Ligand SMILES: O=C[C@H](O)[C@H](O)[C@H](O)COP(=O)(O)O
């Protein structure tokens with residue numbers, strides 16, 4: 001059987017909607033990630049939306065898509081707890097540590113994930129790697145610190161690339177910050193690197209979700225969906 | 233002899249200008265803090281400004297004051313290194329760990345301090361405490377995370393108070409964020425607490441300068457200026 005990457009993303013989006021229906025009680029609020037795979041989950045969740053109160057969203061794009069389906073979106077400050085957060089990843093390793101932030105809303109994703117009891121990572125097989133780092137690591141930085149943080153990254157052998165828009169000017173996040181996409185790191189200890197980068201003044205968020213990684217991953221392969229589980 | 237708090241701030245500002253003239257070579261760029269004590273330093277530095285190229289500033293207010301003295305202000309991205317950063321503190325303990333952020337520009341102060349080789353804390357005697365925490369600890373937070381971070385702080389017995397302007401609406405920082413001023417913590421291990429809070433998604437900066445604390449403190453007492461030194 002031949003499945004394209006888009007078909008594998010649909011498979012895991014549907015599998016995640018089933019995970020929610022199987023594990024999350026009626027009336028719950030669902031934490032919703034960002035990106036192409038998450039969008040497949042949103043479409044699948046829409047089919048069962050009547051059993052849930054609504055969602056907490058990790059991005060402007062996700063909020064727009066949820067709303068296009070008539071799903072209620074709650075600001076996180078309104079919500080005392082979340083059982084589940086379903087999101088994609090740019091990469092995931094054997095420990096369930098992830099690189100995220102390749103697209104929008106690095107910071108928001110990490111915040112929603114921090115509240116949710118269970119992080120369900122949905123990804124096609126190409127996202128599972130032996131060692132994180134070949135996908136550039138996003139670091140959200142206060143602009144005044146751009147060069148200071150870049151030098152710290154270069155000291156580690158990292159190649160920091162300021163994220164730019166089509167028009168060549170700096171991408172700016174929702175909180176008025178820049179992103180350095182860092183290439184050339186071979187991240188054998190993601191929890192340790194996460195703590196080190198979080199300790200640098202001027203860093204807002206680092207796209208290593210490792211101290212709080214995936215609890216499970218629904219992985220869409222050419223032979224079907226695999227369910228991978230990880231320890232806290 | 234009787235000295236007011238304002239007179240003690242002037243004493244340490246002047247002492248810091250002498251520290252700079254004694255230790256920092258002609259042509260250097262000086263890192264400049266924020267607040268009332270820092271403003272005394274700015275006024276004293278202005279008297280010797282012809283021997284220095286200019287300054288890197290930690291706040292809008294500081295930049296305005298430097299400029300009022302005809303001191304050139306460089307954006308930090310223009311500057312490869314800084315020998316010294318002179319700034320106040322809301323509190324400083326025996327290890328030279330500080331609480332800062334009580335006034336403006338928590339994040340900027342911490343960034344400039346991170347680049348400077350030597351942090352000179354200027355403070356009157358009332359700032360030296362046995363244990364940090366009676367001055368509320370500022371935590372800069374992404375607004376979506378306000379309640380999530382507040383709950384983590386309450387778990388520690390902290391009383392998180394959203395910072396408000398005179399008009400009662402939330403103070404917003406330069407990076408579009410809120411500040412929680414946290415009361416009731418008794419911070420016996422500031423480096424550990426700093427790392428814990430820096431590890432929470434939604435935290436931008438925490439006003440514990442502990443992993444990188446003061447290298448020395450010029451402390452203005454009723455018996456004169458004391459010079460205190462601390463280890464990295
Ligand atoms: O910043 C975007 C998110 O972290 C996404 O979850 C990640 O980039 C994966 O997106 P996709 O499923 O489109 O590969």
Ligand SMILES: O=C[C@H](O)[C@H](O)[C@H](O)COP(=O)(O)O
Pocket residue numbers: 265266267268269270319320321322331332333334335336337338341
């Ligand atoms: O956010 C303001 C700074 O951290 C100051 O350095 C601190 O608040 C001390 O200011 P002051 O010298 O006015 O007491």
